[PDB]
Amino acid sequence: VKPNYALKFTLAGHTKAVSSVKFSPNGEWLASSSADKLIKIWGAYDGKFEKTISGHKLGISDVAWSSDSNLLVSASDDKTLKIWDVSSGKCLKTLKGHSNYVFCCNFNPQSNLIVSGSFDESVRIWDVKTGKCLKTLPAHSDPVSAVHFNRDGSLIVSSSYDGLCRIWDTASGQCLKTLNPPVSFVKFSPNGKYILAATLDNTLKLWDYSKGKCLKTYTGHKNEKYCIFANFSVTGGKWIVSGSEDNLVYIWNLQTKEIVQKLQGHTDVVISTACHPTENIIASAALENDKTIKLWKSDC
Ligand SMILES: Cc1nc(NS(=O)(=O)c2cc(Br)cc(Cl)c2O)cn1C1CCCC1
């Protein structure tokens, strides 16, 4: 019916806005990125600080885990992405080619490719082993806000401030489909059939991408400025989860679109949220008046 998320830990350490939080696929870790140029690794269940990973020359907008939880990829204002060995903290590769800030990144399920989006309006596809750029897609006419592979890796979805969401064939780089307020976030649904898209008019929408039809709309939060992540919560009740510019985490019922919970505690915009892969745990993180990450746990 409704979850009962409750604050369990607050994680301090970043010295500027947090930009992204992500749980490792094996559930053990939370990774956070920040405008302070750092990645921090934390225990997913107790919030225990594990390590700082450093090397970018400017702030980081996004981080993403490989499928085996051993690698991380980061997107930076220094125009590069970096591939990191999480166990050693070492930079394995620096991915060079974007001509402006890199805003978003993800591995494919195989974790042999990375996709990135940039203020330079392109999407790039990179080889993980060599660190070389394989394709540059002239994807958008304004900064690219999000990029994500689907569940078999054959598709990429991208979104942009130009108002478009596009689906790309990974193998060829060619556009399969296009779907205008700025689109600030997109990702494929767990079952691969839907795309969840945020627009800077305080709206989330669930699209059937095959049919090109909007199936659900979620509102009541505040999102007119920032690229705020949204999530599917797959461990307990079927929820949509998002931060908000009124400093709250919002949780909706996937099917009824009703708000089922709002989490209070942050003291700045909640720019990022993540849902744990096996436990009913949310991580949230806020902009520079707050700079903390919060871990929330529910019984359902
Ligand atoms: C009931 C249902 N399941 C899906 N699949 S899903 O979006 O991928 C998905 C979301 C979540 Br939260 C958790 C899990 Cl486990 C999932 O599989 C869609 N819908 C309804 C049908 C019409 C659109 C909403």
For the chain, domain boundaries: 1-300
What's this structure's resolution in Å?
Answer: 1.5
Ramachandran area for residue 160 (φ above 0: left; ψ -120 to 50: alpha; else beta): beta
| Of 222, 261, 207, 269, the residue nearest 239 (C-alpha) | 261
The Cα–Cα gap between 187 and 196 comes to: 5
206 lines ligand 1 (CB under 6 A): yes
Tokens of 241: 């989860």
Instruction: Say if ligand 1 is within 6 A of residue 254 CB.
Output: yes
Indicate if ligand 1 lies below 6 Å from the C-beta of 158: no
Residue 31 has phi, psi (to 5 degrees) of -105, 140
Looking from the CA of residue 239, the nearest atom of ligand 1 is: 12
Judge if the beta carbon of residue 218 lies within 6 A of ligand 1. Answer: no
**Measured from the CB, is residue 233 less than 6 Å from ligand 1?**
yes
Closest residue by CA, ligand 1 atom 9: 190
| Single-letter amino acid code for the residue at 239 | W
Deposited experimental method: X-ray
Nearest to 284 by CA among 47, 48, 103: 47
Tokens linked to 201: 């008019």
Closest-CA residue, ligand 1 atom 5, reads 191
Q: Is 194 in the pocket of ligand 1 (CB under 6 A)?
A: yes
How far lies 222's CA from each of 52, 82, 239, 259, in Å? 32, 32, 18, 13
Q: Which CATH class is domain 1-300?
A: mainly beta
Q: Which of 187, 189, 239 to mutate to test the pocket of ligand 1 (most atoms within 8 A of CB)?
A: 189
- Closest listed residue to residue 12, CA positions, set 278, 282, 293, 280: 293
User: CA separation (Å) from 281 to 107, 187, 236, 269?
Assistant: 23, 20, 10, 20
Any bridge partners for residue 275, and if so which? 282
Q: Is 260 in the pocket of ligand 1 (CB under 6 A)?
A: no
Write the burial class of residue 223 (CB in 10 Å: 0-12 exposed, 13-18 middle, 19+ buried): buried
Q: Could you write out the three-class secondary structure of 273-291? A: EEECCCCCEEEEEECCCCC
Atom of ligand 1 nearest to the CA of 238: 12
**Cα torsion at 93, 98, 104, 110 (round to 10°)?**
-50
126 in contact with ligand 1, CB cutoff 6 A: no
